[PDB]
Design an enzyme around this catalytic site. Structure first.
Site, mmCIF file in Angstrom:
data_model
loop_
_atom_site.group_PDB
_atom_site.id
_atom_site.type_symbol
_atom_site.label_atom_id
_atom_site.label_comp_id
_atom_site.label_asym_id
_atom_site.label_seq_id
_atom_site.Cartn_x
_atom_site.Cartn_y
_atom_site.Cartn_z
ATOM 1 C CG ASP A 59 -1.881 -1.135 1.301
ATOM 2 O OD1 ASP A 59 -1.566 -2.235 0.783
ATOM 3 O OD2 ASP A 59 -2.976 -1.056 1.893
ATOM 4 C CG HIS A 61 -3.553 3.916 1.532
ATOM 5 N ND1 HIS A 61 -4.737 3.810 0.828
ATOM 6 C CD2 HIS A 61 -3.476 2.804 2.302
ATOM 7 C CE1 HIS A 61 -5.356 2.695 1.173
ATOM 8 N NE2 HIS A 61 -4.609 2.064 2.063
ATOM 9 C CG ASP A 87 -5.304 -0.396 -0.834
ATOM 10 O OD1 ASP A 87 -5.358 -0.688 0.375
ATOM 11 O OD2 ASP A 87 -6.296 -0.675 -1.565
ATOM 12 C CG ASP A 90 -9.328 6.330 -0.966
ATOM 13 O OD1 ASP A 90 -9.658 7.423 -1.479
ATOM 14 O OD2 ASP A 90 -10.091 5.340 -1.100
ATOM 15 N NE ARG A 91 -7.968 4.619 4.918
ATOM 16 C CZ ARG A 91 -8.723 4.461 6.005
ATOM 17 N NH1 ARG A 91 -9.055 5.504 6.760
ATOM 18 N NH2 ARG A 91 -9.139 3.245 6.353
ATOM 19 C CG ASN A 119 -9.616 -2.528 0.096
ATOM 20 O OD1 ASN A 119 -8.428 -2.257 0.114
ATOM 21 N ND2 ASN A 119 -10.404 -2.312 1.131
ATOM 22 C CG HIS A 120 -8.614 2.079 -0.352
ATOM 23 N ND1 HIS A 120 -9.028 3.227 0.285
ATOM 24 C CD2 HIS A 120 -8.629 1.098 0.584
ATOM 25 C CE1 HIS A 120 -9.249 2.961 1.563
ATOM 26 N NE2 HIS A 120 -9.030 1.673 1.765
ATOM 27 C CG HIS A 168 -4.970 -5.177 -2.210
ATOM 28 N ND1 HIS A 168 -3.912 -4.309 -2.063
ATOM 29 C CD2 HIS A 168 -5.885 -4.825 -1.275
ATOM 30 C CE1 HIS A 168 -4.184 -3.449 -1.097
ATOM 31 N NE2 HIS A 168 -5.373 -3.743 -0.600
ATOM 32 N NE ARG A 216 -9.569 -6.114 6.035
ATOM 33 C CZ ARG A 216 -8.670 -5.142 5.877
ATOM 34 N NH1 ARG A 216 -9.047 -3.904 5.543
ATOM 35 N NH2 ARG A 216 -7.384 -5.411 6.044
ATOM 36 C CG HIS A 243 -6.265 -5.954 2.458
ATOM 37 N ND1 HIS A 243 -6.989 -4.813 2.199
ATOM 38 C CD2 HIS A 243 -7.162 -6.872 2.896
ATOM 39 C CE1 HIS A 243 -8.263 -5.023 2.478
ATOM 40 N NE2 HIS A 243 -8.396 -6.266 2.898
HETATM 41 MN MN LIG Z 1 -6.491 -2.642 1.014
#
Ligand SMILES: [Mn+2]
Lengths: 295, 59
Positions: A59, A61, A87, A90-91, A119-120, A168, A216, A243
């Protein structure tokens, strides 16, 4: 007509700067990156078969400064080959610079630079966790829609020299044959359940026997013996996934048959983890380059 | 020279060396909880979908 060398140069211009210096590309250039990369993704398999040597990253991000630290350590393309596990957005503060550089490198070195879906990389997560807001603040909502279209075509897993399975999140109770991954058609959104959702959402769990529930509220957890059986059946040696933030940037599971990689150190200013990157050489020998947390 | 196609995997043990206590037991528990609190993307999937839906019904 898109000037990739100019896009990369400009993105790379902030290399010495203090963390957070923006790069302002033109709207049409960003669209170009999306359209040209989307085209390449669709033309390559959804299940990548790759050769070592290469570097594998988890990741990011939107931690652009940290993306530049990774290339600094591992070699800017094409000095080294890269596989990223997803990923990208985001974030963090700089999702745009991050995905743009990765998309630009995808276009420049299409057989030496690879990007899996996380997943992002999904509108259902993107709307809320920063990327949409970033697109709106700096450009417009239409750009976010363009990114969504690009993301929907990202490949989903990679196998490195018939030995290292990369995706991922992790395994799926529905993953019986590699052909099932190959059968997924694109563009596609990420479903709420099933194979594609699990590949991007599942987690390993020490305390779980078989398949268990996931805190989750999406997908599942899987135990060590699930990993062991899978490698045995499919004649592999290692699962490599991302992840989950981990304290040392990487973390082994199931007597080293699975590794979690996470590449953003000091994750979103909330953790003080290290970030790691995995070097796989020609004999499939794996080593880890750590980005230490802030001193 | 591309690496897209369409050996046995070992570990750099010198690299694992170069890169539990009850006091450390706590630090790990706190990280695990911090992490579980952080990963709430599940809570908002429905919301995000509805937001996308109505932005479409705008036109
Ligand atoms: Mn993820």
């Amino acid at each position: 007509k898109l000037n990739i060398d100019s896009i990369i140069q400009r993105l790379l211009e902030v290399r010495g700067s203090k963390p957070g210096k923006n790069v302002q590309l033109q709207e049409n250039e960003i669209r170009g990156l999306c359209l040209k990369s989307r085209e390449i993704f669709l033309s390559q398999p959804i299940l990548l078969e790759l050769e070592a040597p290469l570097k594998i990253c988890g990741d990011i991000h939107g931690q652009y400064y940290d993306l530049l630290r990774l290339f600094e350590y591992g070699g800017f393309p094409p000095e080294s080959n890269y596989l990223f596990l997803g990923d990208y957005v985001d974030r963090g503060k700089q999702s745009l610079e991050t995905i743009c550089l990765l998309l630009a490198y995808k276009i420049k070195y299409p057989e030496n630079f690879f990007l899996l879906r996380g997943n992002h990389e999904c509108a259902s997560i993107n709307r809320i966790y920063g990327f949409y807001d970033e697109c709106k603040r700096r450009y417009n909502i239409k750009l976010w829609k363009t990114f969504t279209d690009c993301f929907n075509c990202l490949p989903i897993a990679a196998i490195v020299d018939e030995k290292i399975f990369c995706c991922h999140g992790g395994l799926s109770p529905d993953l019986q044959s590699m052909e099932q991954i190959r059968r997924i058609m694109r563009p596609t959104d990420v479903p709420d359940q099933g194979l594609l959702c699990d590949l991007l959402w599942s987690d390993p769990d020490k305390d779980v026997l078989g398949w268990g529930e996931n805190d989750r509220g999406v997908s599942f957890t899987f135990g060590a013996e699930v990993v062991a059986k899978f490698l045995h059946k499919h004649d592999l040696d290692l699962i490599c996934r991302a992840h989950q933030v981990v304290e040392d940037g990487y973390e082994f599971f199931a007597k080293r048959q699975l590794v979690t990689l996470f590449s953003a150190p000091n994750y979103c200013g909330e953790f003080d983890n290290a970030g790691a990157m995995m070097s796989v050489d020609e004999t499939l020998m794996c080593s880890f380059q750590i980005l230490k947390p802030a001193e | 020279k591309g690496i897209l196609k369409n050996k046995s995997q070992k570990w750099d043990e010198m690299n694992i060396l170069a890169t539990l206590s009850p006091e450390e037991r706590e630090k790990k528990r706190q990280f695990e909880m911090k992490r579980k609190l952080h990963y709430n993307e599940g809570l908002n999937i429905k919301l995000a979908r509805q937001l996308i839906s109505k932005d479409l019904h705008d036109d």
